């Protein structure tokens, strides 16, 4: 009968819920899952619908289908704030109560306080957002035939050359032949620009793979501006600093992949956070709070070996949920808990539909091999939450 | 030796060129065809791509494929003005000289000086235009999911309940189930509004056909506002006058089918025009110029029997091309020419993919029968200009 509530049905949230489903026995606890939408979207593949290389429906699944209900109660609503003292959470259309709290609200875009970014730029963070990005670009290409002078319609600027930016421009480059044919556009006129403040694309990554990534993307017509930061964002385009002087790029479409931050709700609810994320204990709990757990991008963990923190990823997020699910079972049964130890296997980044790069098991991988791996790994997630049934669909 | 120049590759233009092609024996005259694009689009079917019910490629064909290269020389360029005195036409990328001139530049949207109409509203008049309208609407639906409070995204206002407007709103209603499913939208929230200044939808049409049209469209959720004029057009929406008082409609998409005028080029070239169109003589030429011919929407014709003017249509435009081609051929070859006599067969209006209305001959038509009738008649044009080969390609 205790009331555990999980906030967000993302990688951290949905796995924690499914873990609880398998682990526990009917009526042992009251579990409620809260989500903004009635569907759970595969964030790792969201860059593809934004380009238009994949339908958005292939990147999402209905939550009710995943759960058997009765054990877990699903609430479709929007979280507003956290009342920790009165162990309750407030929604736009109601209020909920928790004995135990699991926080997996994912990330929010990090704008760095840059002017006009929130107003005039797009983010790849949801099914709704990527649909908007996709239709915006196609809309812009449609307008070009009427006004051939306006080449800014055909200019797409992606801010930041992180994994998200690199994956996106790769998909974008692949789409352009089909896109140009649809709207009678000269492929040569199209400009896809990736702008990176850091001196190198994909900073903190193996130079061998990075150069390979740039080489392939450069061949597909992607343009890279490195050591160039975005100072400001305008409706017309963006403003960048080159050689200590401001320069302007006129782009009808600006996508911001500059970084991510923890959900503002967590920080605004009075938690102590760094970059909006919580530095949790070995048991994935929020300091000074024995009944609160943080999962996914909201959680922050530091590798004891080095001084740097683990990056926010789906891979570690899945591991968060499974750990919390097991630990929650122990707490409900009055048992001890197990410290969280993250096993970070290789990471693979796609460079389009048929190409990819990654370091897996210490070994570097490229080409069709890496592409098949990522497709395989992503499919493994489908099996984890939906079984062979989900993989087929 | 003589230089025949044809302006525009629309219904009037393309048929006139093809008519000359069949009629003449090469080298007899120098024929040049001028078009804004290297393709000829089926304007009668343009309402479907704008809605998104049909691909735009099915509504156009390449001009070079249709014509006999050696006999007719095709120029892809944009007409700027016509110099009647010097008998030359000026383009963005050159100049051309004519002994005989055929003008089929089609129509331009008529805004009637209404504020913001040209700036903030869309027109269904080209391949480029319908693509813009289509992607615009899908874009607004995409934004709605993020902001469910903004129901104006799902509101589409079509100005004028003429022939074009009725076809467009009919196509739109059919699209909505597929469109709503794509962007997770509640169909009940969607509003398709047709605004008519006249007291009745489809003025000057059989009330029986009109009532059927409103009934079918009304069932699909289409809303009609009649006796209501559009005072102004804004990015936010439109302003309308109801019961002598101003009212507001919030619509992300505004499409203007309120009417058309002849191409501005004809008027700016010093021609004498009414509503931008030329009232031609029985030989479809502009008074008193014996060597200039006007075809399609640019031309204005009066029915001798009923004194009322013919509406600007593709059907009469096609007949213009055939008449001018025959008359031009006769003129260079010696003939006495033939006065233009329009044979106006029935007209059919689609009310969606599976429904239609029309008066053919003396009998009124409805349902799948009318739809098949309209589809067949449209196919006749494809055969006329492209043969069985063009007909195959859908
Ligand atoms: C294009 C892209 C590609 C990526 N590829 C990879 C990859 O290949 N490998 C890898 O390891 N990582 C990848 N990542 C990173 C990974 O997707 C994130 O780290 C992952 O989303 C984190 O899991 P999460 O559940 O905490 O976040 P999320 O998946 O975003 O969980 C958010 C969920 O909580 C809901 N929610 C949020 N706020 C509220 C609120 N106020 N009220 C109600 N519901 C709310 C949301 O609707 C959503 O359902 C990628 C990220 C992006 C953008
Ligand atoms: C949705 C819609 C549905 C319709 N359905 C029917 C129907 O069912 N039956 C019927 O009889 N009529 C119908 N009509 C009307 C018909 O389409 C027109 O009346 C017909 O096109 C008139 O012939 P036209 O060649 O003069 O016009 P157009 O087809 O518009 O001729 C214009 C051509 O010349 C080109 N051009 C224009 N300006 C320039 C320029 N400055 N320089 C170079 N090239 C230029 C254009 O690109 C185009 O190729 C419909 C119209 C619309 C909008
Ligand atoms: N295959 C994978 O494992 C995979 C794929 C995608 C994302 N991810 C993870 O998702 C997380 C989110 O990554 P992300 O791509 O959203 O951001 P990021 O933090 O990983 O990279 C941000 C980049 O943007 C640049 N940048 C920031 N501000 C800028 C500005 N004003 N102008 C120009 N450039 C600017 C930074 O230098 C940085 O290189 C990462 O931890 C990443 O590791 C993993």
Coordinates of C-alpha atoms in Angstrom, one line a residue, chain A:
Chain A
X1 CA 0.0 0.0 0.0
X2 CA 2.7 2.7 -0.1
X3 CA 2.4 5.2 -2.9
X4 CA 5.4 5.4 -5.1
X5 CA 5.2 8.0 -7.9
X6 CA 7.5 8.1 -10.9
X7 CA 7.8 11.4 -12.8
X8 CA 8.4 11.1 -16.6
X9 CA 8.2 8.0 -18.7
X10 CA 11.5 8.4 -20.5
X11 CA 14.4 5.9 -20.5
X12 CA 15.0 6.4 -16.7
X13 CA 11.3 6.4 -15.9
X14 CA 9.8 3.6 -18.0
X15 CA 12.5 1.1 -17.1
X16 CA 12.1 1.9 -13.4
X17 CA 8.4 1.2 -13.8
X18 CA 8.8 -2.0 -15.8
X19 CA 11.4 -3.1 -13.3
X20 CA 8.9 -2.6 -10.5
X21 CA 6.3 -4.5 -12.5
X22 CA 8.4 -7.6 -12.9
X23 CA 9.8 -7.4 -9.3
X24 CA 6.7 -6.8 -7.2
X25 CA 3.5 -8.8 -6.4
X26 CA 0.0 -7.3 -6.8
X27 CA -1.3 -4.9 -4.1
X28 CA 2.2 -4.8 -2.4
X29 CA 2.6 -1.1 -3.4
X30 CA 0.7 1.7 -5.1
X31 CA 2.7 2.8 -8.2
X32 CA 1.8 5.8 -10.3
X33 CA 3.5 6.9 -13.5
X34 CA 3.2 10.5 -14.7
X35 CA 3.9 11.7 -18.2
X36 CA 3.2 14.8 -20.4
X37 CA 1.9 12.5 -23.2
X38 CA 0.2 9.2 -23.4
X39 CA 3.2 7.9 -25.4
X40 CA 6.9 7.2 -24.8
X41 CA 9.3 8.4 -27.4
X42 CA 12.7 6.9 -28.4
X43 CA 14.9 10.0 -27.9
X44 CA 17.9 8.3 -29.4
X45 CA 16.3 8.2 -32.8
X46 CA 14.5 11.6 -32.8
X47 CA 17.1 13.2 -35.1
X48 CA 15.7 11.1 -38.0
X49 CA 12.1 12.4 -38.0
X50 CA 13.4 16.0 -37.7
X51 CA 15.3 15.5 -41.0
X52 CA 12.3 13.6 -42.5
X53 CA 14.2 10.4 -43.0
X54 CA 11.9 8.5 -40.7
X55 CA 8.2 8.8 -39.7
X56 CA 7.7 10.0 -36.1
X57 CA 5.4 7.1 -35.3
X58 CA 8.4 4.7 -35.6
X59 CA 10.0 6.7 -32.8
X60 CA 7.2 6.3 -30.2
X61 CA 5.0 3.8 -28.5
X62 CA 1.9 3.9 -26.3
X63 CA 2.6 3.6 -22.6
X64 CA -0.7 1.7 -21.8
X65 CA 0.5 -1.0 -24.2
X66 CA 3.7 -1.5 -22.3
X67 CA 2.2 -1.8 -18.9
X68 CA -0.4 -4.4 -17.6
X69 CA -2.0 -1.7 -15.5
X70 CA -3.7 -2.7 -12.1
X71 CA -0.2 -2.9 -10.6
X72 CA 0.8 0.5 -12.0
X73 CA -1.5 3.4 -12.5
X74 CA -0.7 5.7 -15.4
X75 CA -1.4 9.4 -15.2
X76 CA -1.3 11.6 -18.3
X77 CA -0.6 15.1 -17.0
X78 CA 2.1 17.8 -16.7
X79 CA 4.2 18.1 -13.6
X80 CA 4.4 21.7 -12.3
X81 CA 6.3 21.7 -9.0
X82 CA 7.5 19.5 -6.1
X83 CA 6.2 19.9 -2.6
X84 CA 8.8 17.7 -0.8
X85 CA 7.8 18.7 2.8
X86 CA 4.1 17.9 2.2
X87 CA 5.3 14.8 0.3
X88 CA 3.1 15.6 -2.7
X89 CA 3.6 16.6 -6.4
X90 CA 1.5 19.2 -8.2
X91 CA 0.2 18.9 -11.7
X92 CA -1.7 21.3 -14.1
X93 CA -4.9 19.2 -13.8
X94 CA -4.4 17.7 -10.3
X95 CA -2.2 16.8 -7.4
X96 CA -0.4 13.6 -6.4
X97 CA 1.1 12.1 -3.2
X98 CA 4.3 10.2 -2.7
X99 CA 5.9 8.0 -0.1
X100 CA 8.8 7.5 -2.5
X101 CA 9.6 9.7 -5.5
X102 CA 11.4 8.8 -8.7
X103 CA 12.5 11.8 -10.8
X104 CA 13.1 11.1 -14.5
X105 CA 11.9 14.3 -16.2
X106 CA 14.8 14.2 -18.7
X107 CA 16.7 17.2 -20.0
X108 CA 16.0 20.7 -21.1
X109 CA 17.9 22.7 -23.7
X110 CA 20.8 24.7 -22.5
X111 CA 20.7 28.2 -24.1
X112 CA 23.6 29.7 -22.1
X113 CA 21.4 32.9 -21.8
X114 CA 22.0 33.5 -25.5
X115 CA 19.7 36.1 -26.9
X116 CA 16.8 35.0 -29.2
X117 CA 17.7 31.3 -28.9
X118 CA 14.5 30.3 -27.1
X119 CA 12.4 32.5 -29.4
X120 CA 13.8 31.7 -32.8
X121 CA 15.5 28.3 -32.6
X122 CA 14.4 24.7 -32.5
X123 CA 15.3 21.8 -30.3
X124 CA 15.3 18.1 -30.8
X125 CA 13.7 17.0 -27.6
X126 CA 10.2 15.6 -28.4
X127 CA 7.9 14.1 -31.0
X128 CA 6.1 17.4 -31.2
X129 CA 9.3 19.4 -31.7
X130 CA 10.8 17.2 -34.4
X131 CA 7.5 17.3 -36.4
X132 CA 7.7 21.1 -36.2
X133 CA 11.4 21.1 -37.3
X134 CA 10.6 18.8 -40.2
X135 CA 7.6 20.7 -41.5
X136 CA 9.4 24.0 -41.0
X137 CA 12.2 23.0 -43.3
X138 CA 9.9 21.6 -45.9
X139 CA 7.9 24.8 -45.7
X140 CA 11.0 26.8 -46.3
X141 CA 12.0 24.8 -49.4
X142 CA 8.5 25.2 -50.7
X143 CA 8.8 29.0 -50.5
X144 CA 12.1 29.1 -52.4
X145 CA 10.7 28.4 -55.9
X146 CA 8.6 31.6 -55.7
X147 CA 11.6 33.6 -54.4
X148 CA 14.8 32.2 -55.9
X149 CA 16.8 35.2 -54.6
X150 CA 16.2 34.0 -51.0
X151 CA 18.8 31.3 -50.5
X152 CA 18.5 31.7 -46.7
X153 CA 15.4 29.4 -47.2
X154 CA 17.9 26.7 -48.2
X155 CA 20.3 27.4 -45.4
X156 CA 20.1 25.3 -42.2
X157 CA 22.3 26.2 -39.3
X158 CA 22.9 23.7 -36.5
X159 CA 24.3 25.2 -33.3
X160 CA 26.9 22.9 -31.7
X161 CA 28.7 20.0 -33.1
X162 CA 28.0 17.5 -30.3
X163 CA 26.7 14.0 -31.0
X164 CA 23.1 15.3 -31.5
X165 CA 24.2 17.9 -34.0
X166 CA 26.5 15.5 -35.9
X167 CA 23.8 12.8 -36.1
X168 CA 21.2 15.4 -37.2
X169 CA 23.3 17.0 -40.0
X170 CA 24.1 13.5 -41.3
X171 CA 20.4 12.7 -41.6
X172 CA 19.7 16.1 -43.0
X173 CA 22.4 15.6 -45.7
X174 CA 20.8 12.3 -46.7
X175 CA 17.3 13.9 -47.1
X176 CA 18.4 16.7 -49.4
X177 CA 18.4 14.8 -52.7
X178 CA 14.7 13.8 -52.1
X179 CA 13.9 17.2 -50.7
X180 CA 15.4 19.1 -53.6
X181 CA 13.6 17.0 -56.1
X182 CA 10.3 17.6 -54.4
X183 CA 10.5 21.4 -54.5
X184 CA 12.6 21.9 -57.7
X185 CA 15.6 23.1 -55.8
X186 CA 19.2 23.2 -57.0
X187 CA 21.1 20.9 -54.6
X188 CA 24.2 23.1 -55.0
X189 CA 22.3 26.1 -53.5
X190 CA 21.5 24.3 -50.3
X191 CA 23.8 25.0 -47.3
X192 CA 23.9 22.8 -44.2
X193 CA 26.1 24.5 -41.6
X194 CA 27.3 23.0 -38.3
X195 CA 28.8 25.7 -36.0
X196 CA 31.0 24.6 -33.1
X197 CA 32.4 27.0 -30.5
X198 CA 35.1 24.5 -29.5
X199 CA 38.3 24.2 -31.7
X200 CA 37.2 20.7 -32.9
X201 CA 34.0 19.0 -34.0
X202 CA 32.9 16.4 -31.3
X203 CA 35.2 17.7 -28.5
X204 CA 36.7 15.2 -26.2
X205 CA 36.5 12.4 -28.7
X206 CA 39.0 10.2 -30.6
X207 CA 40.5 12.4 -33.4
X208 CA 40.6 9.4 -35.8
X209 CA 36.8 8.9 -35.8
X210 CA 36.2 12.7 -35.7
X211 CA 38.2 13.3 -38.9
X212 CA 36.4 10.4 -40.5
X213 CA 33.0 11.9 -39.4
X214 CA 33.9 15.3 -40.9
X215 CA 35.2 13.6 -44.1
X216 CA 32.0 11.7 -44.7
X217 CA 29.8 14.7 -43.8
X218 CA 31.9 17.0 -45.9
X219 CA 31.4 14.7 -48.9
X220 CA 27.6 14.9 -48.4
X221 CA 27.9 18.7 -48.5
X222 CA 27.8 19.5 -44.8
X223 CA 29.8 22.6 -43.8
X224 CA 31.7 22.9 -40.5
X225 CA 32.6 26.2 -38.8
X226 CA 35.0 25.4 -35.9
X227 CA 36.4 27.7 -33.2
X228 CA 33.3 29.8 -34.0
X229 CA 30.7 30.5 -31.3
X230 CA 27.1 31.6 -31.7
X231 CA 26.7 35.0 -30.0
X232 CA 23.1 35.7 -30.8
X233 CA 20.0 34.3 -32.6
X234 CA 17.7 36.4 -34.9
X235 CA 14.6 35.6 -37.0
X236 CA 16.8 36.2 -40.0
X237 CA 19.5 33.9 -38.8
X238 CA 22.4 33.7 -36.3
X239 CA 25.3 35.9 -35.3
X240 CA 28.8 34.3 -34.9
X241 CA 32.2 35.5 -33.9
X242 CA 35.0 34.8 -36.4
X243 CA 38.6 36.2 -35.8
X244 CA 37.3 38.4 -33.0
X245 CA 34.8 40.1 -35.2
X246 CA 31.0 39.5 -35.5
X247 CA 29.7 38.0 -38.7
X248 CA 26.2 37.1 -39.8
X249 CA 24.6 34.0 -41.3
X250 CA 21.2 34.3 -42.8
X251 CA 19.3 31.1 -42.2
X252 CA 15.5 30.6 -42.2
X253 CA 16.1 27.4 -40.1
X254 CA 18.2 27.3 -37.0
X255 CA 18.4 24.2 -34.9
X256 CA 20.0 24.4 -31.4
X257 CA 22.1 21.3 -30.4
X258 CA 24.4 23.4 -28.1
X259 CA 23.8 21.2 -25.1
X260 CA 21.4 20.0 -22.4
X261 CA 20.5 20.8 -18.9
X262 CA 18.5 19.1 -16.1
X263 CA 14.8 19.8 -16.0
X264 CA 14.1 23.3 -14.5
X265 CA 11.5 21.8 -12.2
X266 CA 14.1 20.0 -10.1
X267 CA 16.2 23.0 -9.5
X268 CA 13.2 25.3 -9.0
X269 CA 11.8 22.9 -6.5
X270 CA 14.7 23.7 -4.1
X271 CA 17.1 20.9 -4.9
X272 CA 20.8 21.7 -5.0
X273 CA 21.9 21.1 -8.6
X274 CA 24.9 21.5 -10.9
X275 CA 23.8 22.3 -14.5
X276 CA 20.3 21.5 -13.3
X277 CA 21.4 17.9 -12.4
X278 CA 21.6 16.3 -9.0
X279 CA 24.8 14.7 -7.7
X280 CA 23.3 11.6 -6.3
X281 CA 24.6 9.2 -3.7
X282 CA 25.8 5.7 -4.6
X283 CA 22.1 4.6 -4.2
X284 CA 20.8 7.1 -6.8
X285 CA 19.1 9.2 -4.2
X286 CA 19.0 13.0 -3.6
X287 CA 21.2 14.1 -0.7
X288 CA 19.4 14.8 2.6
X289 CA 16.4 13.0 1.1
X290 CA 16.0 9.3 2.0
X291 CA 12.9 8.7 -0.1
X292 CA 13.8 10.6 -3.3
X293 CA 15.5 8.9 -6.3
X294 CA 16.9 10.6 -9.4
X295 CA 17.2 8.8 -12.8
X296 CA 18.4 9.6 -16.3
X297 CA 19.5 13.0 -17.4
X298 CA 18.3 14.6 -14.1
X299 CA 20.8 12.5 -12.2
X300 CA 24.5 13.4 -12.2
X301 CA 27.3 10.8 -11.5
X302 CA 31.0 11.3 -11.3
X303 CA 33.6 8.6 -12.2
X304 CA 35.7 7.9 -9.2
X305 CA 38.7 7.0 -11.4
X306 CA 38.9 10.5 -13.0
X307 CA 37.6 13.9 -12.1
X308 CA 35.0 14.2 -14.9
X309 CA 31.3 13.3 -14.6
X310 CA 29.5 10.8 -16.7
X311 CA 27.6 12.3 -19.7
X312 CA 23.8 12.3 -19.9
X313 CA 22.9 9.3 -22.0
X314 CA 20.1 6.8 -22.6
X315 CA 22.5 3.9 -21.9
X316 CA 23.2 5.1 -18.3
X317 CA 19.6 6.1 -17.9
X318 CA 18.4 2.6 -18.5
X319 CA 20.9 1.4 -15.9
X320 CA 19.5 4.0 -13.5
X321 CA 16.0 2.6 -13.8
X322 CA 16.9 -1.0 -13.2
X323 CA 18.9 0.0 -10.2
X324 CA 16.1 2.1 -8.7
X325 CA 13.6 -0.7 -9.4
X326 CA 15.6 -3.3 -7.5
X327 CA 16.4 -0.9 -4.6
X328 CA 12.8 0.2 -4.4
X329 CA 11.8 -3.4 -3.9
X330 CA 14.3 -3.8 -1.1
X331 CA 12.9 -0.6 0.6
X332 CA 9.3 -1.8 0.4
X333 CA 10.2 -5.2 1.8
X334 CA 12.4 -3.7 4.5
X335 CA 15.7 -4.9 3.0
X336 CA 19.0 -3.3 2.3
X337 CA 20.0 -1.6 -1.0
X338 CA 22.7 -2.1 -3.5
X339 CA 25.1 0.7 -4.6
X340 CA 24.9 1.8 -8.2
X341 CA 27.8 1.0 -10.5
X342 CA 27.6 2.2 -14.1
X343 CA 28.9 -0.2 -16.7
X344 CA 29.7 2.0 -19.7
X345 CA 30.0 -0.1 -22.9
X346 CA 30.9 1.4 -26.2
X347 CA 29.1 4.3 -27.7
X348 CA 28.1 4.5 -31.4
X349 CA 27.1 7.7 -33.3
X350 CA 25.3 7.5 -36.7
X351 CA 26.6 9.6 -39.6
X352 CA 23.5 9.0 -41.7
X353 CA 21.3 6.0 -42.6
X354 CA 24.2 3.9 -43.9
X355 CA 27.2 5.1 -41.9
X356 CA 28.3 5.4 -38.2
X357 CA 31.2 5.9 -35.8
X358 CA 32.0 4.6 -32.3
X359 CA 34.4 3.2 -29.8
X360 CA 33.0 -0.1 -28.7
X361 CA 34.8 -2.2 -26.0
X362 CA 37.9 0.0 -26.5
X363 CA 37.9 -0.9 -30.2
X364 CA 37.1 1.8 -32.8
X365 CA 34.4 1.0 -35.4
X366 CA 33.3 2.8 -38.6
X367 CA 31.2 2.2 -41.7
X368 CA 28.4 -0.3 -42.3
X369 CA 29.6 -2.3 -39.3
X370 CA 29.0 0.6 -36.9
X371 CA 25.7 1.4 -38.5
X372 CA 24.4 -2.1 -38.1
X373 CA 25.6 -2.1 -34.4
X374 CA 23.6 1.0 -33.5
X375 CA 20.6 -0.4 -35.3
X376 CA 21.1 -3.6 -33.3
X377 CA 21.6 -1.8 -30.0
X378 CA 18.6 0.4 -30.5
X379 CA 16.5 -2.7 -31.4
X380 CA 17.8 -4.3 -28.1
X381 CA 16.0 -1.5 -26.2
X382 CA 12.8 -2.3 -28.0
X383 CA 13.1 -5.9 -26.9
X384 CA 13.8 -4.8 -23.3
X385 CA 10.6 -2.8 -22.9
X386 CA 8.3 -4.3 -25.5
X387 CA 9.6 -7.7 -26.2
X388 CA 9.8 -9.3 -29.7
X389 CA 6.3 -7.9 -30.3
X390 CA 7.6 -4.3 -30.2
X391 CA 10.6 -5.1 -32.4
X392 CA 8.3 -6.4 -35.1
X393 CA 6.1 -3.3 -34.9

